[PDB]
Ligand SMILES: OC[C@H]1O[C@H](O[C@H]2[C@H](O)[C@@H](O)[C@@H](O[C@H]3[C@H](O)[C@@H](O)[C@@H](O[C@H]4[C@H](O)[C@@H](O)[C@@H](O[C@H]5[C@H](O)[C@@H](O)[C@@H](O)O[C@@H]5CO)O[C@@H]4CO)O[C@@H]3CO)O[C@@H]2CO)[C@H](O)[C@@H](O)[C@@H]1O
């Protein structure tokens with residue numbers, strides 16, 4: 001304790017790393033010792049399992065999932081401001097079981113390195129290298145030499161025509177796994193129906209009726225999104241924006257929508273549309289103009305969002321958003337919405353029980 | 367042609383959008399017309415299918431996958447500099463079948479909106495709202511009113527206790543789908559073995575032998591990563607770094623490694639380790655010190671990577687990286703490497719045929 005021991009491979013810049021450690025000690029008094037043991041990536045699980053080893057281990061990320069599965073790595077805790085400083089795909093490489101288990105440093109790939117004076121135009125194909133070697137051999141030279149003891153160096157050739165390690169299956173929505181008629185869905189809709197039966201709400205309330213009632217001070221609360229705030233600003237009501245109420249102790253989970261602008265495939269103006277959206281709308285000034293009319297909520301444009309993030313209404317918007325879920329964009333989403341609309345309206349009006357309404361919606365969607 | 371027609375929903379800031387369109391026309395002469403038809407999200411697939419409709423359509427992203435499946439949307443083409451200006455998860459929301467099919471604008475979620483003067487401390491639970499309503503009703507008021515005709519507004523309550531739309535299955539490596547002994551793997555290893563048989567290479571060449579031969583000008587080419595460049599700089603050789611050769615017309619596919627720093631779970635210095643890695647190593651000055659010793663390649667730190675990106679050696683590194691694949695971090699990766707090492711060494715030395723070596727590796731991994 002009171003020290004840092006670092007392990008890094010002997011082909012990396014460990015002397016330069018030790019100079020970073022010297023600056024660390026000069027500022028903090030904490031000694032940093034950089035070592036480069038052989039087989040460090042095999043020794044680490046052996047010594048960390050006994051509670052020994054280095055404080056920090058450097059390796060390519062392919063070793064780290066095995067370490068994390070064995071409980072040998074601490075979860076790292078960079079805040080969002082620090083995570084923003086590194087490329088997102090590098091954080092992905094060090095994420096295991098949903099947790100960040102290392103700090104990414106550098107991105108490595110093999111390349112062809114060539115002597116400009118022996119091969120001014122290096123070969124573009126592997127197949128032409130034997131002919132080049134024959135000409136170099138009469139000069140006492142060879143075309144190419146690389147490490148054949150480590151599979152890292154031969155893998156690019158093995159993969160070229162179709163070799164691979166493990167196949168990756170992309171994330172996907174299971175369009176047959178729908179949760180509209182499970183017990184939790186029924187419990188929430190039953191509560192809504194119970195409020196209607198108890199005359200706390202009326203089944204015929206729509207957007208206009210609820211907005212007028214809230215903005216005239218006739219009801220204490222409403223549920224709406226950022227576009228509604230402008231009309232409340234103009235009203236007499238002093239309003240706050242906060243977390244949706246919990247149900248059975250669990251957060252309400254609103255669907256998160258990304259307002260998006262698509263370009264019609266039939267448009268003869270695709271270049272103009274790109275210019276307008278990229279260079280006029282998606283600017284601080286462009287979004288401010290729309291936002292001043294009806295608030296957008298949080299915006300996708302980082303520079304303008306940092307100016308909105310302070311507003312408690314935006315903070316509440318993002319707190320509810322985090323408790324909820326981003327909507328799928330799959331084609332089946334419209335079928336989902338049409339079916340759920342019918343279920344809620346039928347249950348709220350008494351044309352169906354909650355169970356029969358949601359069962360029918362589930363059948364329609366799947 | 368020569369116009370922009372925009373469709374946006376009637377609850378959004380369409381007058382503010384039209385002012386952005388006015389500025390567009392003032393600068394370009396191109397008229398922008400903003401309309402807010404009812405049912406625009408249903409009308410669009412009907413009119414875009416006939417080659418009509420608006421140039422740009424605004425909606426939440428949940429509608430857009432259906433449009434893109436129907437071929438109604440143009441692929442949008444923002445460059446990397448523009449994509450960097452928006453939050454990554456917003457681009458994810460508008461990606462369909464691997465392609466970006468809209469521009470994200472805003473991030474929306476419902477919140478509880480409350481009258482500060484009627485309910486200074488708004489309810490944290492749904493279950494307490496009936497009691498609040500009874501007290502407000504004696505004052506001629508009600509606790510809460512919101513739109514019950516659109517399922518968007520009731521969904522947060524339905525999802526709270528377990529309702530969901532479509533279940534998402536996270537991306538994953540299939541540890542039983544291994545490509546070490548397929549036809550492409552065998553073809554590439556066979557070519558390596560054929561070069562060895564033809565005496566273009568020697569099976570016993572290792573890292574040291576290849577590095578010495580290249581850096582003394584005895585071989586025209588080598589295959590190595592960025593850490594090797596420092597020793598070539600000091601040598602007499604004038605070297606370039608370029609794309610790996612193709613095989614059977616296809617790019618060589620090197621495995622991409624992210625050099626990573628993990629913190630030992632047994633370390634009593636986890637706070638010091640975080641301080642060192644975040645505030646000393648992962649700085650421009652910290653990475654420069656390591657990089658000056660042995661080059662890191664591309665770095666994860668955006669600010670320093672932008673200073674390296676100009677170097678043709680780094681450009682070539684990233685070109686090869688893009689043709690290749692990020693390594694998995696799964697625990698099975700070490701088994702993969704050990705098995706492939708044995709296969710390559712055995713095939714190159716003649717202790718096994720290419721087919722028998724790679725079949726054995728495949729069996730060992732699975
Ligand atoms: O005693 C018997 C045997 O020992 C010797 O070989 C062994 C090695 O000493 C030992 O390190 C071990 O090597 C394994 C390694 O543990 C395993 O992780 C995997 O290595 C991968 C890396 O994980 C991967 O990142 C990548 O490594 C790159 C690295 O990213 C890059 O930054 C730079 O450092 O180059 C590295 C490549 O050299 O690829 C490697 C795979 O090539 O697989 C390794 C095995 O190949 O186990 C070795 C075998 O026991 C002696 O060399 C051997 O002669 C003896 O027979």
Ligand SMILES: OC[C@H]1O[C@H](O[C@H]2[C@H](O)[C@@H](O)[C@@H](O[C@H]3[C@H](O)[C@@H](O)[C@@H](O[C@H]4[C@H](O)[C@@H](O)[C@@H](O[C@H]5[C@H](O)[C@@H](O)[C@@H](O)O[C@@H]5CO)O[C@@H]4CO)O[C@@H]3CO)O[C@@H]2CO)[C@H](O)[C@@H](O)[C@@H]1O
Pocket residue numbers: 225257334337338341375377405407408426427428429474515516517518519
């Ligand atoms: O004529 C019969 C019937 O017509 C009327 O209802 C129909 C609507 O006019 C019509 O627009 C259509 O509504 C569908 C919609 O097409 C479908 O996409 C889906 O809507 C989702 C959104 O996709 C989703 O983004 C979200 O919308 C939010 C939005 O994100 C937010 O920014 C803001 O605008 O609030 C929106 C919510 O209002 O959620 C909605 C779902 O609530 O589902 C819609 C159906 O609910 O089809 C309607 C039914 O035919 C009349 O209203 C009706 O009385 C008539 O019986």
